[PDB]
Subunit: 219 residues, 6 copies
């Protein structure tokens, strides 16, 4: 990483950050908290550090390939928007980055260090990290076993376990916040069991989750 | 976090702080010591760091949703009190924060770093942390299985195990210190078994817990 | 904590200090080494840090309540000795602390940081730590199962196991060093078995523990 | 290692970096993620540090010998390109490195520290690290049990497990990116089972992996 | 501890140093390597830190008492040699230490910090550490089960296991290097079995341990 | 140790370096990777630190004695080459070291710190470390169960397991690189089974290990 006397300084990714990242993917495959874990472990990371984390994953090579193809599509999108001009980089400057420079594959650690601390900074680590999170969300979606359309409360299932399953499956749905808003409002109460489904009607369409779970405790 | 040469400096949340936070929620669900643990692990944290801790929680998504709704209500309360004025942020200043900026969702790490160290500081991490603790207390209450009204000493139960159960259940009650004061004074001795319930009367209504447990050791 | 370039600096309590403190109380309840552990883990701690350690204890809430009542009695003793004067705190100064400010309950981290580093320093962490250790000793006493009066050497019990039990029980007795001096001198040899009890007489009343255990090795 | 106030500074390789490296080779023998692990643990390393990691490997001495012979061939290639001139190293300079100086075997830590920080730097750690990775790839190839030519989808094998096996075996193939490109394009779909092999034809020869795995989910 | 910019600085004893020290005494009681461990963990320690390590030992309170009595005897020896003069400590100076000040029992951390860094330094930590090691050696001796006089090679016992037992028992003998020299030279070969006892004679009285163990490999 | 602002600074050996060193010797006795581990853990170490590591070894006291005798022989060799001159050490200088000063036994930490950082430096830690590694190699040799002369490929033994055993036993042989060169060239192919022994002849006497193991894969 790089961490802010106040003069900025470059460290290697620590063994426990790495060991933490690897044990996470061994245990939980790809799920939403894995991505938070990814983002959490990667604070201030250079592309080198990001590639480190991705190459140390053994197994799951279909997912790691999908992620490779995703990164290349964002790189091509970067290239199209940001064309590379001809001519020699004058003394006292640094070259403008390509898509592959941002993905760590055709840049040195110094150039990554150069872009990140320069005024203004081209935040290449943060740009790349987006592309990686993009591709991880695509994977999470694909490997999510169930659709949110199929989360129905069972006859004896206490309401709170039903809400746990609903929102877990919702967390892995790749759809925008307004869609999610609509599924919370439409599907949650729509797919409850007859008993609770009744009990919640009597609160009204704009009641909180805290209000709804207190309603169906006694049920 | 940010930690105080004496010049302030910004670090990433460490892997063990994170690993500690995750293992805590895996093991103990939501109980009062979890919140102390939360507060303890989050010292000096930015909103980014606070969101990190909350998103790495797998499972319990009903609780994490309730917490989401709580945070939005405090944000709306913040917005109403603190309206955002029109006009461009002049050079040498920083914008005044919205509710969503405080919750890390619509601010950068730099802006969070900006507010926290500026003179005077807008302590956004500390404000957000309150809202999160607010919502965690609401959860602890909801998931507490028993009411304090139902903690009765059993015929053979030594007094000290009864006090352990009383104060554990009391710790999860969401009621102010004066109410708690009253429950200690009224209910504790009121719900003891006939034997100890007698033995404590003979001390009087203003005796300490150390005095009461010595009284009922021999019982 | 705060730790001494030489300019003083404020850190958060580390995850392993915390994890160490919690695992200690899970395992060994309240015994004398727990208090050494407490003191050891708390070096340079602010009241915030001290409260952190105490609130992360799950279970044992009778003990944690007793400790609460103890802290309040020392706070009232502090208040009586140190009254708070009327009038506004002039620029370039800091307020004099109340009992509750010392117990971290009605002070900020900055004020605690203020008192500790100021010239002269009001060492609030160290004052509070005393009150906490005070209340922990009261607990250790109460939860000690046996009295020192009841440690008698058994007929086949080698002398060294008897000395181990004597001094362990003595460590949990809440009585001053001169009392302890007297119990070592009177009770140890007085409660040995007939065989060793004899063998030690022949050394005289002012012989060391090293001399006494060599005496009763062959017995 | 050496890690960037901003003045550069030399540290010893930490016990956990070492312990991490050793446990990796105990567990997983030689596979592609081991090399990422190698590269990851070795950031900023001197040749001393690189030799440290290689000598602490117990077992696998055939592989460690092959690696020895590989390093000597790159050293001889270095020597041939970079001949060592006669004459005394003038005051205010440092000698130009031989192949064996780069491999840490005939240089001090100071000389390695000298080359790495000097202006311009001879990056000896990074040069050596290449030679080591070179020899590790040769080992991974040799110890890979299967050829990519033999990865055929089985009749009941869901497509995603087949892709996992394909790309895992591909990761250990020592052939350039254009060859790999060709194997992805030719062999993957060519070696699928009749069912999926059909289903993918109907997308066309230029469809993504995300598109192909969605195609064969329902199969 | 205190550890050497170059300006000296005071740290708390770390949780793992402490946890390491406690686990050592739980596992191995008192043996020679425990003392090396003690010395090793205590580098640069103040008396506070030394007392920390000693009070966190649960169990073994006979040994910890013996150690208490030993420390008091060295303190009285210190007092007799170093009498405390009358009169007020002038501004710009610090008091001369008593025996109890050196044992951490009647001094603050500041005074310990004062003596250690002052010019000239009174190295109180190092003086106390001696007294503690003194008392630990006395304990190791006492708790050593066997005398070196009783280590005889058995008829089938390979020579190297006999040497392992000899020198282990010798390490716990409290006798000076010249005595140890004599026991190596007299007893080792004197207590070997008839076979090896012969075989070594034929080398002569001034042969090394490497020479003697090669001699008795084939036996 | 001592580790390079750029001003040099002295640290204590860390608990995990120590714990790592002790667990290594508990597990693997004395083998070549133990020595790499030794060298690896001891980077920048003073003689104090080196003695720390050696005294914390419990068990194996025959080996630790042999090592003691070895160190004394190198000390006597040092003394003979480097005689100690008469006369008082003038102000602004430091004494020249004896053999026992280098072995940490008759020098302070300050004097060790003095020699190591002075211009020019007498690198006492590095000199001592050599003597210790010298004596460890002598031990490894002695405790190696098998001679390289006895490593013969068995009839069904795949070639690669045979190479693993050959080079493992070779790593523990105490003979120079030219001897080792000769054993690789003469014995390896000379002691293979009839089948492989044939197959390798047909490559010629100057073929690599990578070439030889590919040759005997199909066998
Ligand atoms: Cl820094
Ligand atoms: Cl680390
Ligand atoms: Cl997956
Ligand atoms: Cl890779
Ligand atoms: Cl940009
Ligand atoms: Cl479900
Ligand atoms: Cl800093
Ligand atoms: Cl960490
Ligand atoms: Cl919960
Ligand atoms: Cl998330
Ligand atoms: Cl504010
Ligand atoms: Cl209960
Ligand atoms: Cl600092
Ligand atoms: Cl930590
Ligand atoms: Cl308790
Ligand atoms: Cl709390
Ligand atoms: Cl005061
Ligand atoms: Cl007892
Ligand atoms: Cl530094
Ligand atoms: Cl470390
Ligand atoms: Cl292998
Ligand atoms: Cl080696
Ligand atoms: Cl170069
Ligand atoms: Cl396969
Ligand atoms: Cl410092
Ligand atoms: Cl630590
Ligand atoms: Cl013991
Ligand atoms: Cl104590
Ligand atoms: Cl002195
Ligand atoms: Cl024995
Ligand atoms: Cl430093
Ligand atoms: Cl450490
Ligand atoms: Cl051995
Ligand atoms: Cl020792
Ligand atoms: Cl020299
Ligand atoms: Cl073998």
């Amino acid at each position: 990483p790089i961490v802010q006397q106040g003069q900025m300084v470059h460290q290697a990714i620590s063994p426990r950050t790495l060991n933490a990242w690897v044990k996470v993917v061994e245990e939980k495959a790809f799920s939403p908290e894995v991505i938070a874990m990814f983002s959490a472990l990667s604070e201030g990371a250079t592309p080198q550090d990001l590639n480190t984390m991705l190459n140390t994953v053994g197994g799951h090579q279909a997912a790691m390939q999908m992620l490779k193809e995703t990164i290349n599509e964002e790189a091509a999108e970067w290239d199209r928007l940001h064309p590379v001009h001809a001519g020699p980089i004058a003394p006292g400057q640094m070259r403008e980055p390509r898509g592959s420079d941002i993905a760590g594959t055709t840049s040195t650690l110094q150039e990554q260090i150069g872009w990140m601390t320069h005024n203004p900074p081209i935040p290449v680590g943060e740009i790349y990290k987006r592309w990686i999170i993009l591709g991880l969300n695509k994977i999470v979606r694909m490997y999510s076993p169930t659709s949110i359309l199929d989360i129905r409360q069972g006859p004896k299932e206490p309401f709170r376990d039903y809400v746990d399953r609903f929102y877990k499956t919702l967390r892995a749905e790749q759809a925008s916040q307004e869609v999610k808003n609509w599924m919370t409002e439409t599907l949650l109460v729509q797919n409850a069991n007859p008993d609770c489904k009744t009990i919640l009607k009597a609160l009204g369409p704009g009641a909180t989750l805290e209000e709804m779970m207190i309603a169906c405790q006694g049920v």
